[PDB]
């Protein structure tokens, strides 16, 4: 699942918007990335 202290946000007119960090207080249009490879 996604990280502790988030939410997923959605839409204004055409159906766009994705993610917002709640403990920080930051809006975005992507996930926190979260996929390891060397680290």
């Amino acid at each position: 699942k996604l990280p502790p202290g988030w939410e997923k946000r959605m839409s204004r007119s055409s159906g766009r918007v994705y993610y917002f960090n709640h403990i920080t207080n930051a809006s975005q249009w992507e996930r926190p990335s979260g996929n390891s490879s060397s680290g």
């Binding site: 946000r9 766009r16 918007v17 917002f20 809006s27 975005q28 249009w29």
Partner: peptide, 13 residues
Amino acid sequence: KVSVVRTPPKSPS
């Protein structure tokens, strides 16, 4: 503080 939700760049129009 009141706010709109902020996308990091913008929508491409």
